[PDB]
Amino acid sequence: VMEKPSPLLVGREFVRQYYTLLNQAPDMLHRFYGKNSSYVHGGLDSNGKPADAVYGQKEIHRKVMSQNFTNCHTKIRHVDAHATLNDGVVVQVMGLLSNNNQALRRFMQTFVLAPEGSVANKFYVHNDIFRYQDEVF
Amino acid sequence: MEKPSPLLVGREFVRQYYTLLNQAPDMLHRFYGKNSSYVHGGLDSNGKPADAVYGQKEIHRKVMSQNFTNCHTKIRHVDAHATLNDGVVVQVMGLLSNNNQALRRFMQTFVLAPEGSVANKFYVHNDIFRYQDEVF
Amino acid sequence: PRITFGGPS
Amino acid sequence: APRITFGGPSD
Numbered sequence: 001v002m003e004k005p006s007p008l009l010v011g012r013e014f015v016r017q018y019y020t021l022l023n024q025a026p027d028m029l030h031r032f033y034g035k036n037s038s039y040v041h042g043g044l045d046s047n048g049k050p051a052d053a054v055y056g057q058k059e060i061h062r063k064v065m066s067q068n069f070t071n072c073h074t075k076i077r078h079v080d081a082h083a084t085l086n087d088g089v090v091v092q093v094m095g096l097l098s099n100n101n102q103a104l105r106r107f108m109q110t111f112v113l114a115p116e117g118s119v120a121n122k123f124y125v126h127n128d129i130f131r132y133q134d135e136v137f
Numbered sequence: 138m139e140k141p142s143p144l145l146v147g148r149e150f151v152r153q154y155y156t157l158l159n160q161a162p163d164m165l166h167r168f169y170g171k172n173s174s175y176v177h178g179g180l181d182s183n184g185k186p187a188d189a190v191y192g193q194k195e196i197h198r199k200v201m202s203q204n205f206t207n208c209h210t211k212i213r214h215v216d217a218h219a220t221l222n223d224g225v226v227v228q229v230m231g232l233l234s235n236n237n238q239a240l241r242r243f244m245q246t247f248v249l250a251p252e253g254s255v256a257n258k259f260y261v262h263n264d265i266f267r268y269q270d271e272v273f
Numbered sequence: 274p275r276i277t278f279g280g281p282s
Numbered sequence: 283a284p285r286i287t288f289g290g291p292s293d
Contacts (some may be wrong), residue, residue, distance in 0.1 A: 005286055031289055032290065035291075038219070078267065080246070082174040082189065084248050085220070085222045085262060086221050088221050090246060090263050092246040092265045094267060094272045108230060108269075112220045112248075113288075114221055121284050124288065124289060127226050131216070133242075133269075136214045137242060138274055168280065170282075173280070193282070252278075257274050257275060258276075258279065259276070259277075260278065261278070
């Protein structure tokens with residue numbers, strides 16, 4: 001009978017794996033998510049406010065591939081991870097992201113990681129909220 | 138009527154939370170419970186951003202030590218989504234000033250959990266606030 | 274609906 | 283212990 005991991009360790013390790021996967025195989029990113037996961041990654045509606053959110057692995061994959069991630073580079077400047085409801089981990093990431101060798105843009109992201117349930121110490125992404133500062137401020 | 142949307146819960150919370158932070162931060166501790174996590178920026182002595190406190194009493198002590206005076210807030214974006222156990226995760230982006238100093242851009246993360254004894258009542262399980270100038 | 278906030282105290 | 287892993291439940 002082992003011990004459950006600390007929230008900081010889970011959040012840091014997840015941030016690592018998430019952004020390396022975003023850079024190396026973004027078409028794989030959907031594998032982080034479940035049937036009931038929410039996902040938004042910035043975006044601005046035409047003459048409208050920030051974009052809305054899609055749900056579930058298939059729609060999340062569709063959105064990710066429509067975002068056309070190429071040579072994604074991420075500079076992480078801050079990560080918080082705290083225990084939350086039913087052994088979850090809430091994570092707040094502050095950093096810079098550049099897609100397709102374009103502008104290095106400041107962003108804020110909120111993750112909620114939940115236990116996958118079947119495999120010990122496995123987590124999936126229940127919530128993924130990403131916003132660029134230059135689309136808000 | 139029916140069960141409120143996560144967005145309605147998040148927007149109403151943002152309004153109540155920052156209104157209370159302006160008018161009576163001494164009452165802000167009422168939002169939290171025994172297992173609530175709280176961090177509101179801060180740069181530790183010769184190093185990285187500060188750590189976090191737990192429990193309503195220690196949270197009240199931290200809020201008191203921050204000396205919130207005439208707090209002013211300009212909210213620029215609010216995200217609110219359903220999360221585990223009918224909770225709501227809120228991402229706030231905005232500007233915050235204390236003691237009539239210049240406004241500073243911030244990014245806040247909330248987890249609101251059903252309080253469990255009153256319908257449509259929530260408490261703050263997690264409160265992660267960060268000034269971005271301390272980070273970038 | 275009526276949405277309120279506060280710990281379970 | 284087991285290492286920390288990440289991934290959906292495959293349901």
